[PDB]
Design a binder for these strands. Sequence first.
RNA 1: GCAUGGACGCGUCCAUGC
RNA 2: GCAUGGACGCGUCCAUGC
Lengths: 70, 71
Amino acid sequence: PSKLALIQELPDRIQTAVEAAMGMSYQDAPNNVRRDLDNLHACLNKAKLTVSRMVTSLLEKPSVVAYLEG
Amino acid sequence: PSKLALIQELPDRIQTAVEAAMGMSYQDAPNNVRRDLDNLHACLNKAKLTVSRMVTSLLEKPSVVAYLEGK
RNA sequence: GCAUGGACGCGUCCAUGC
RNA sequence: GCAUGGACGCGUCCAUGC
């Protein structure tokens, strides 16, 4: 795969690494563990959004884009 | 794949999604582009570290592990 | 109270782009 | 000015251990 692709695929690959964990349910979990698992969801969500934002920043830099392809 | 395994695999599933981009070399690129891609690396290493620290912090809590296991 | 992890708010500084 | 990322400081909330 080309470098431009390597970066464009980041947000999705990360989507994949994480979808299983934050796709599981903890309806029976106690209030204190429910809060901790919710904190995990927030942590993953923020890592997901950050990478996503980072890549959008990278692909809006005409310089970075030019290099990634020629 | 139980709930416990589901969470234990995180740091690894994350390394996977990220190693391709991170193995990529850009040492032939211009200085400003080299800087942004270093910032990319800095950024991704922090995401991996945050998640790992989160998972470890979680798996050290007897209350949460008990739940994930099934007790 | 001490420490750890995360989220969030305020500010300082560094880099990059427009 | 705007945007993104990183470092640092201060503060708030949650959780855990002692």
